[PDB]
PDB file of C-alpha atoms in Angstrom:
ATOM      1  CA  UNK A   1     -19.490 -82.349  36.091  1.00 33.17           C
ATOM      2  CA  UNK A   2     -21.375 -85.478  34.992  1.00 34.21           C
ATOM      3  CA  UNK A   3     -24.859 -85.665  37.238  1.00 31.30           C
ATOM      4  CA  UNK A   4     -26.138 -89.044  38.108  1.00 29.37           C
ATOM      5  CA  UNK A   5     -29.927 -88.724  37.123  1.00 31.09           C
ATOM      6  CA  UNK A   6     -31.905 -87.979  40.051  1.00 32.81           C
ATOM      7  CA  UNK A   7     -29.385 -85.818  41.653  1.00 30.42           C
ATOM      8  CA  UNK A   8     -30.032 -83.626  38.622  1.00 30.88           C
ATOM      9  CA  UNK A   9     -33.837 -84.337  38.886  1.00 31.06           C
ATOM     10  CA  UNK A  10     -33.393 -82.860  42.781  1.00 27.17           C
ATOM     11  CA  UNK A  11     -31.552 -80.191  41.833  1.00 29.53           C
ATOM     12  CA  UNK A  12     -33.619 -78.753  39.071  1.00 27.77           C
ATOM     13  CA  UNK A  13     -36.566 -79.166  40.957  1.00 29.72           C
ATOM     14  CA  UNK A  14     -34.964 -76.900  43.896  1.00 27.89           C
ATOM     15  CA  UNK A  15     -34.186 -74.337  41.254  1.00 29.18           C
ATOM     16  CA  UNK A  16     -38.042 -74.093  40.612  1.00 27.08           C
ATOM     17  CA  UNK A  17     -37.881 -76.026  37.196  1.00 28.66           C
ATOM     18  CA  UNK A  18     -40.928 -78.147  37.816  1.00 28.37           C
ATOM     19  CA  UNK A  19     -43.788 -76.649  35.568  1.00 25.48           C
ATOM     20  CA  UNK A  20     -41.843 -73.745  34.757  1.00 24.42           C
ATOM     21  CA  UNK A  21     -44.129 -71.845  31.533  1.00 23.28           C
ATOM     22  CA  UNK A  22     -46.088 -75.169  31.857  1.00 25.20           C
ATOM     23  CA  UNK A  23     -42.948 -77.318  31.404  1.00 25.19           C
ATOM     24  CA  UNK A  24     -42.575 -80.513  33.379  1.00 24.47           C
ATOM     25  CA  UNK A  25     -39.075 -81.478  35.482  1.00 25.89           C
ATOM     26  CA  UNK A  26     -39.641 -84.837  33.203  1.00 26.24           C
ATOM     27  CA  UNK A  27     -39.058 -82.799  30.568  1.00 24.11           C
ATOM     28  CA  UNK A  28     -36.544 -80.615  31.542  1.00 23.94           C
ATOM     29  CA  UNK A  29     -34.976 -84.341  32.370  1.00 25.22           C
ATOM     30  CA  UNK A  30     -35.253 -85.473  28.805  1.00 24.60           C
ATOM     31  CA  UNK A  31     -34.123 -81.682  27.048  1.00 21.86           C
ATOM     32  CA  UNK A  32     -30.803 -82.082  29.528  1.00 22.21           C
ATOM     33  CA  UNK A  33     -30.042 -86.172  28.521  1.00 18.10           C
ATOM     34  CA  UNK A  34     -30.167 -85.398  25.049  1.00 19.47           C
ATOM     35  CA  UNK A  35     -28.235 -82.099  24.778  1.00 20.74           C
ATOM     36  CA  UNK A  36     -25.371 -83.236  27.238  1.00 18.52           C
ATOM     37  CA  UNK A  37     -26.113 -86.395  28.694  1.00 19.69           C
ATOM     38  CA  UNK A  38     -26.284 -84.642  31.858  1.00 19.34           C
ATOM     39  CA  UNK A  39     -22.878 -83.400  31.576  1.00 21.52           C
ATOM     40  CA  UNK A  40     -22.117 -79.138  32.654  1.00 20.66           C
ATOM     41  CA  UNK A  41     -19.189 -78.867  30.234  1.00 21.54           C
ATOM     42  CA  UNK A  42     -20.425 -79.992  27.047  1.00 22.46           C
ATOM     43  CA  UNK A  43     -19.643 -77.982  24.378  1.00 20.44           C
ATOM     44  CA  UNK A  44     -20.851 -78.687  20.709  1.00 19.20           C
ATOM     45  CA  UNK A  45     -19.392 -75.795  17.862  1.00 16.34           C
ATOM     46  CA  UNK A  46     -22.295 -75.244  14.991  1.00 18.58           C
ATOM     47  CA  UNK A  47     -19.370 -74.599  11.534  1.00 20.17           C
ATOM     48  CA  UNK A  48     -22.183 -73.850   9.435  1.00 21.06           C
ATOM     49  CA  UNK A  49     -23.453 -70.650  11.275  1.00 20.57           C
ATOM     50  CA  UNK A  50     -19.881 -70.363  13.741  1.00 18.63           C
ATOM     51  CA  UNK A  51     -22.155 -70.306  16.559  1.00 20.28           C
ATOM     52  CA  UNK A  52     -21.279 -73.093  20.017  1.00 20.56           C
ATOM     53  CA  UNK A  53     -23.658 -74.455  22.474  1.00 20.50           C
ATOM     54  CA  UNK A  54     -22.648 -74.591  26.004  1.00 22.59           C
ATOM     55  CA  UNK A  55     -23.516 -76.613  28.886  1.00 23.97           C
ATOM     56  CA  UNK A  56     -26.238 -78.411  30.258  1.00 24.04           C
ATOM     57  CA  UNK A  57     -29.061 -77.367  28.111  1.00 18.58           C
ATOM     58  CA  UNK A  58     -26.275 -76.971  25.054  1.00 18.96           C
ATOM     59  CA  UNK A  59     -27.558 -72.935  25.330  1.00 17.70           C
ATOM     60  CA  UNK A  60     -26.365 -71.450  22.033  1.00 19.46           C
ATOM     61  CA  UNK A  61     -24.290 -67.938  21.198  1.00 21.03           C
ATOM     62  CA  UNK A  62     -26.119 -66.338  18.984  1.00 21.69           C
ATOM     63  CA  UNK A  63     -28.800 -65.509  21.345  1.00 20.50           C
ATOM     64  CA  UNK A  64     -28.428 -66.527  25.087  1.00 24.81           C
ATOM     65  CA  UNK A  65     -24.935 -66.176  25.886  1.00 22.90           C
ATOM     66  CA  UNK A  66     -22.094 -63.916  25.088  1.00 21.33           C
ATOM     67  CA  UNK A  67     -18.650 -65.331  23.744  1.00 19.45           C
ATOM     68  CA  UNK A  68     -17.426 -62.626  21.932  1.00 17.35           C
ATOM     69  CA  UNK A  69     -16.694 -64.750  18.896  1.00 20.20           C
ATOM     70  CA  UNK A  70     -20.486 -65.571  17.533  1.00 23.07           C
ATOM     71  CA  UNK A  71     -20.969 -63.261  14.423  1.00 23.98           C
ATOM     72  CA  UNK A  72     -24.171 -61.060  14.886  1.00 27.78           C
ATOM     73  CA  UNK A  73     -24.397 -62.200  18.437  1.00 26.01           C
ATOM     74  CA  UNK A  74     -27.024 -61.120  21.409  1.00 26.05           C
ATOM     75  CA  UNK A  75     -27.129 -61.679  24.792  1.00 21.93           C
ATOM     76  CA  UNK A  76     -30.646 -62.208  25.137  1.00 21.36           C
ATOM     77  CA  UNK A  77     -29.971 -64.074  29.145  1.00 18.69           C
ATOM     78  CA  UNK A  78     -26.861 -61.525  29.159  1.00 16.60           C
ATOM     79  CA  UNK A  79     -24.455 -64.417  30.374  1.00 18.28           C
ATOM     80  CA  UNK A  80     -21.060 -65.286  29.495  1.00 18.70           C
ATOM     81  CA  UNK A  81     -20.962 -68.481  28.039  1.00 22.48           C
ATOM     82  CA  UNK A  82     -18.298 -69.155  30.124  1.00 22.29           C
ATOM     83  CA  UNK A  83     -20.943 -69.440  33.538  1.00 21.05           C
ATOM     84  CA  UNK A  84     -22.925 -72.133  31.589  1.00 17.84           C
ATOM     85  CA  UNK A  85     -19.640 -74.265  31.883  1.00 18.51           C
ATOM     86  CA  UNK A  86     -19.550 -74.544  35.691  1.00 16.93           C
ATOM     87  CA  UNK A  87     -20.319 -77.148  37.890  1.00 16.76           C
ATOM     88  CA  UNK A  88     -23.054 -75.610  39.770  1.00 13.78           C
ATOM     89  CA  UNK A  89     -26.133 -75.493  37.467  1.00 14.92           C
ATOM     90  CA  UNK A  90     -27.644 -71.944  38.903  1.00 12.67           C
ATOM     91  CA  UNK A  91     -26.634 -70.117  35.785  1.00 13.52           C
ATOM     92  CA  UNK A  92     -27.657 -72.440  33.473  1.00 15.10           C
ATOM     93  CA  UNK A  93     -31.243 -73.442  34.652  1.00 14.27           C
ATOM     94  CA  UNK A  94     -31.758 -68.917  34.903  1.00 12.89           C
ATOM     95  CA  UNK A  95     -30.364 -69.168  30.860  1.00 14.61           C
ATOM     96  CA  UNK A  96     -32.889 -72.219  30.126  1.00 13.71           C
ATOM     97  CA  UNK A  97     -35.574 -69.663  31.865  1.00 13.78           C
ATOM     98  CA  UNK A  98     -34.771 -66.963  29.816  1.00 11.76           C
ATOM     99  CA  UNK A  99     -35.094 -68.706  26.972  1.00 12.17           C
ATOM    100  CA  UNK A 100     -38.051 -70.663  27.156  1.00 13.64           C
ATOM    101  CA  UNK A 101     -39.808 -67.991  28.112  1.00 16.42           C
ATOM    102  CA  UNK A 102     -39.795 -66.909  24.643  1.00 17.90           C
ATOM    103  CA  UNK A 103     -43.046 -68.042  22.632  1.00 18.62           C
ATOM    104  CA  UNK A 104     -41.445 -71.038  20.968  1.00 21.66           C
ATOM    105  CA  UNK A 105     -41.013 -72.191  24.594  1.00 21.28           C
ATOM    106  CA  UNK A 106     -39.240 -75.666  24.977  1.00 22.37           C
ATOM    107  CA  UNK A 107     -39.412 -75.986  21.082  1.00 19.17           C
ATOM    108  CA  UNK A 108     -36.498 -73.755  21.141  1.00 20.04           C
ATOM    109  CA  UNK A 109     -34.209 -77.003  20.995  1.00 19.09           C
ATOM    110  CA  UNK A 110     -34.642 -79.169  17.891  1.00 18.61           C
ATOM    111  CA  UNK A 111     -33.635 -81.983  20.095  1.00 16.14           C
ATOM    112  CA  UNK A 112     -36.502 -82.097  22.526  1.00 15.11           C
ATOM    113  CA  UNK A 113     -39.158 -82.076  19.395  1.00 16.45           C
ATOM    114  CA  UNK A 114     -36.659 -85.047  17.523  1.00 17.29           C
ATOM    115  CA  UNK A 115     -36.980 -87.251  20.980  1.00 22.06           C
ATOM    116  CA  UNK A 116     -38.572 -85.863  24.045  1.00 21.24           C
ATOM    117  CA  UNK A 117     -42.101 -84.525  22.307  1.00 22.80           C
ATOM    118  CA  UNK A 118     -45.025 -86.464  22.593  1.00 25.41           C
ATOM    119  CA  UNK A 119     -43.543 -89.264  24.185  1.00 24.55           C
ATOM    120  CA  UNK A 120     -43.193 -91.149  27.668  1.00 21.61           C
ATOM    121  CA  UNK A 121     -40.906 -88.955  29.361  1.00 20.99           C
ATOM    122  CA  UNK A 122     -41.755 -90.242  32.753  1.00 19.59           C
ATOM    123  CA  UNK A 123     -38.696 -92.769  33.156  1.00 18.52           C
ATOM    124  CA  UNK A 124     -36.577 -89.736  33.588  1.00 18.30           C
ATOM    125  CA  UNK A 125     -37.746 -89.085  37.261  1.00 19.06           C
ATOM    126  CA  UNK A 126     -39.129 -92.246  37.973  1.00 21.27           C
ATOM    127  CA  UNK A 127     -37.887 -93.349  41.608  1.00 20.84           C
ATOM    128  CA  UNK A 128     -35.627 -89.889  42.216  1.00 21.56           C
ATOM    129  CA  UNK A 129     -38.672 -88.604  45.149  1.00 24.28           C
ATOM    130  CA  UNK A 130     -39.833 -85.748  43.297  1.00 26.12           C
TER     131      UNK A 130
END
């Protein structure tokens, strides 16, 4: 599924993703639009270290989810990469949790640093009610 932008806003911020380890829905909002474009089946193989990112938040094998064929793999969230693939976004947003609740916190994903850090994030949920 593709979410229209503040559906997703809505949604995460039902899930208790607003200010979650001090992290803002607007930038959970700008994390999701440049890993996926908002899109739940996104899935983006890594050939230099045969690890793939799945969903969402692009949440990688190696650490957070399980797909059986990641070398040297852990299931840190203890999903199957397979949940971070559906439609409804529960499993995911409890993975993005998990793994931001590490000390590297939302630095975990290059891309947030590369175009979400230190910048105006607020057009993300600007006029979604939340």
């Amino acid at each position: 599924k593709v979410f229209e932008r503040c559906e997703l806003a809505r949604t995460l911020k039902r899930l208790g993703m607003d200010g979650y380890r001090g992290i803002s829905l607007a930038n959970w909002m700008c994390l999701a639009k440049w890993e996926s474009g908002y899109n739940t089946r996104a899935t983006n193989y890594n050939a230099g270290d045969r690890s793939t990112d799945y969903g969402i938040f692009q949440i990688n094998s190696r650490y957070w989810c399980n797909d059986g064929k990641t070398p040297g793999a852990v299931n840190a969230a203890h999903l199957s990469c397979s949940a971070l693939l559906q439609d409804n976004i529960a499993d995911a947003v409890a993975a993005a949790k998990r793994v931001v609740r590490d000390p590297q916190g939302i630095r975990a994903w290059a891309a947030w640093r590369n175009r979400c850090q230190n910048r105006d994030v607020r057009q993300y949920v600007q006029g979604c009610g939340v």
